[PDB]
């Protein structure tokens, strides 16, 4: 069975992708995250730090990782009617931690992306606004700066 060191290794391997994007590897990370919500705090701090630290052209893929895990966890909260935003080891708390950094992560990823990746980030902002993943007021602040 996939363990946390495997999760680390998989994320580390994104460096080796020209595009920084892999649907199958994102799916592996997301399945692991859904199976190990009991350690979401270190999963979440890692994917936040991956977005902070990855190369410029890989910023888009870092937001796809956050999108995949974030909306999988968001779906759990609605299946489970849970809003324990401050309880570690819960989907609601994981999404809350991501939301506290998401404006920083978006601003940096957009600023460091070329025009093509910027347009793909714009599409993510649409999906995050429609799905309810992050506070719309946070996404508004980003969208008004970069996409209006």
């Amino acid at each position: 069975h996939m363990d946390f060191q495997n999760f680390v290794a998989t994320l580390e391997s994104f460096k080796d992708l020209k595009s920084g994007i892999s649907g199958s590897r994102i799916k592996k990370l997301t399945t692991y995250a859904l199976d190990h919500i009991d350690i979401e705090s270190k999963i979440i701090s890692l994917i936040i730090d991956y977005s902070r630290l990855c190369p410029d052209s890989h910023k888009l893929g870092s937001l796809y990782i956050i999108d995949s895990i974030g909306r999988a966890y968001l779906d759990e909260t609605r299946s489970n009617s849970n809003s324990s935003s401050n309880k570690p080891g819960t989907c609601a708390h994981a999404i809350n931690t991501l939301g506290e950094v998401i404006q920083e992560l978006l601003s940096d990823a957009i600023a460091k992306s070329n025009q093509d990746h910027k347009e793909k980030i714009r599409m993510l902002l649409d999906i995050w606004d429609r799905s309810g993943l992050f506070q719309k007021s946070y996404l508004n602040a980003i969208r008004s700066k970069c996409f209006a």
Binding site: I21, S22, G23, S24, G61, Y64, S68, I127
Partner: peptide, 6 residues
């Protein structure tokens, strides 16, 4: 091996 958010 693209990713398209759904």
């Amino acid at each position: 091996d693209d990713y398209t958010p759904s």
